[PDB]
């Protein structure tokens, strides 16, 4: 399968991947790209519905369970913000600080507005400041 | 009003809330039971000594039930009904005793015999409390079957599973006396009569057939050889299989017609097939005792006539000593041959048949697997064939790790079976006529319309019910003459299988799990109660359990690892496999390649092209070389994009300067997505360090052979929450290659890789296009080798990218690579001898 | 006597022998598990399970592989431990063979005082007592002690320690 000299690496891989997509699409969706399930962003997934809700974090709250809740189900921006463990800093990769901010300790009240609508979604953490 | 009564054995105790009106009767048993109960010891490791409170309540129940009379009202009737109710409430939280016994095994320091006695006691109490299993069980399995989430099928083993089959019957008599004691009493009676009905049966039954006395008194039970004789072993195997069926029906509270109605279809292995049709008739508990009488009568008449058509003779001690020195086994009429294809063994039997006359010829009887067969014939002949095979097999300890795959001498196993008659042979044909005449004389005849569920014929795999002729005559022919083809007769699409045959974990069930491994079928060993650590198949508990435990689905590889499609907002279609999900890029990566992928200018290009590539360590011999290259890539790549580093395990210098460096650049947080350790898998200790300390997304590994693969699994088994990319390649790969075929080690391991969802499995070597990879992505590539579909999660291309423009290989080097034709997958193993499509194998330093 | 970790070959050898109900030397070390009992296939999966519980990690197809080169691969991930199967065999022996009252403790202190063999040899001498199981009521403490002494010289003979 080595014949064409100086074929760009981008052109080979793309050519193979698209040849795969082309054979999956024909044999599992009768050549209909409208049948492909879309998401906002595709990645980060480890290989292992309320519009306005309120969570009360404890000093016993499970961190995974906590973050899964705060993220929600839908693939949107807040999904990434709570789940992604690394964020970018130009070309650098650093421990997601948002996960450190919201990290479940006793006294941490989370409210969510517009949970069903990403674009308007607003999380409002609340803590006892002076009492 | 209640007066509490505590009963203890050393440290452990249990409190029962006896009522004060009948407390004098229970406080009379407190002392008398603690008299029967032995002395406390450390661990309670002594036999007949309760280890848990539940066991102590059990032994109480068993003692109380012993002294009570079921016919005559005693003072201890309400005392049994309150202590059993208390046991039921505290310990049996809905689940069957089988689920508790299973829970005690894997939790407490409880041996198997302690569960057997506990269940015996509890089932004696419940039945003898005048509280039979008359209510319907809420078993998740049979609830799901009614719903239509599962389709049960019953299989029934036969001969050659275990030598001491009788000991499976003995246990039942002891552990379920109250459930099957009547049926054993019936069969025992029936046989006692049948031998007086057959003119020359008693001649065969030299040491009698008093099976009741053999159960009661082990001393009276004859020598094991006499038991193994087919006139005794045939009917009794029926009775064991009927026993296990009956015990399951009662404890579920189903009638024999109800349980038969729940199964989609039944079938048996050789003489098991008679048991399969025995349950297909039965309707209620009343019409059952003629359906057994039928079955047992068939197994009586085959079992005797086959012994009078081919009686086992004395064998010269010269053969026995030779066979036991090679340590194959005692010669029998049935020789198992594992790990060989049907044509190969067919070859060898032709050669052995050629020498010998028709009266001493061997034939293939069983076809139990793809590489599992059994030959039948005279034990002289099969010994002579065992002689022929021993010259062809490699020695057991022979290392062919260095020999190229093709010329490695094939290694396999050949033991004789624990059986007395060559079933499915021309040698038992002469019994056929005397079997039929006897079956018609004793008024046994199965009617197609009387059969309710489809029974599958062992020969062709069709339903029995479609027969024009006698069903009995076909069944006889199928057992004595026609060869079983087990894969052919298991073509049905069930979700669960119930092995009621003898042997249990060494019985037909486990064999049929192996055959259908990865086809989404769960086998359950109904005959034996134990714990499988692997949890690939189930035991008795899964039948009876009512929780989510009872319903364990075996994974179907085609469905669970289907290659789906997806697309982000920007309409960029991905292929969405287990790999692609984590990395969020297509599942096509460029491996680590010295020197192709040492050049930053190519690694940065491919990472900007949208694909994952490993920067090869093998071009840089110092920390300062990595850092200069890393930073040269970093400065070229787009924001938020990452790449991998390949290292070499067989260069301990490059590891000892390169691992601490990666740890320092990743503690500062460079975009090093992952680490691959090519050429040799690391030890569990080093691998654990790499996983924890580095702080990477995942850890690629490039295992060479089976031993490596299993060492990878072990690494993943330790960190099940950390992804581990197993980049399996054949010898047919470019660069440092093993002697191993790309496919065959996956065929023999895939199953054991997919038991850990944290292992992303990537297949590399000999790939350059979509068309050649596709079969491996979909999983249809394994259909060529007659396995279930076995899809893969990724694909790495070593040689395909060498001719790419961004690669720093000299234009004339490209022209030389292009010039090379290559070869098909078959011929790659000729590289050792001469140039093969312009490529040859040489030795390193 | 100086301390040495118990080798995997000895623990492997007593576990196979104690399933076979057989003595400590009647098994040849250069032999495969599938060869020993080539007839039956129940003791196959039973021994494979017992070796699993003992040393956790097991290599694929142990039955076709000789015990000596299995022992070296077992030794790599094993460090002088008893494990779940040898713990459950020991308690059984000490409760049913050794008299009630005579438990592991007193039996370990007797070898530690009279012989002065460390806590790692106590495992070995106890394992040799499993492989040649007395299969009898050793009620007489003196008898049991003398048997332990004949199991201390059997341990010293197989390993090569001088007493
Ligand atoms: C030119 C070349 C260099 C390679 N260098 C390495 C290497 O440095 N380390 C390594 O573990 N594997 C190396 N390999 C093996 C590849 O990583 C990969 O396993 C193999 O190429 C797949 O076979 P294919 O080349 O037929 O696709 C190399 C292969 C080639 C062809």
Curated annotation (Swiss-Prot), chain B:
Residue intervals passing through the bilayer: none
Region described as Enoyl reductase: spans on this chain: 476-845
Active-site residues annotated for this sequence: 270
Annotated region (Acetyltransferase), positions in chain: 1-464
Residues found modified as Phosphothreonine: 729
Disulfide bonds: none
General function of this protein: Fatty acid synthetase catalyzes the formation of long-chain fatty acids from acetyl-CoA, malonyl-CoA and NADPH. The beta subunit contains domains for: [acyl-carrier-protein] acetyltransferase and malonyltransferase, S-acyl fatty acid synthase thioesterase, enoyl-[acyl-carrier-protein] reductase, and 3-hydroxypalmitoyl-[acyl-carrier-protein] dehydratase.
Family: Belongs to the fungal fatty acid synthetase subunit beta family.
Subunit organization: [Alpha(6)beta(6)] hexamers of two multifunctional subunits (alpha and beta).
More info: Present with 91800 molecules/cell in log phase SD medium.
Protein name: Fatty acid synthase subunit beta
UniProt organism field: Saccharomyces cerevisiae (strain ATCC 204508 / S288c)
Swiss-Prot record, chain C:
Superkingdom: Eukaryota
Modification after translation: 4'-phosphopantetheine is transferred from CoA to a specific serine of the Acyl carrier domain by the C-terminal PPT domain. This modification is essential for activity because fatty acids are bound in thioester linkage to the sulfhydryl of the prosthetic group.
Domain Carrier residue range list: 6-81
Location of O-(pantetheine 4'-phosphoryl)serine modifications: 41
Other facts noted in the record for this chain: Present with 17000 molecules/cell in log phase SD medium.
Subunit record text: [Alpha(6)beta(6)] hexamers of two multifunctional subunits (alpha and beta).
Role, per record: Fatty acid synthetase catalyzes the formation of long-chain fatty acids from acetyl-CoA, malonyl-CoA and NADPH. The alpha subunit contains domains for: acyl carrier protein, 3-oxoacyl-[acyl-carrier-protein] reductase, and 3-oxoacyl-[acyl-carrier-protein] synthase. This subunit coordinates the binding of the six beta subunits to the enzyme complex.
Protein family (similarity comment): Belongs to the thiolase-like superfamily. Fungal fatty acid synthetase subunit alpha family.
Protein known as: Fatty acid synthase subunit alpha
Gene expressing this chain: FAS2
Residues of the full protein shown: 140 to 302 of 1887
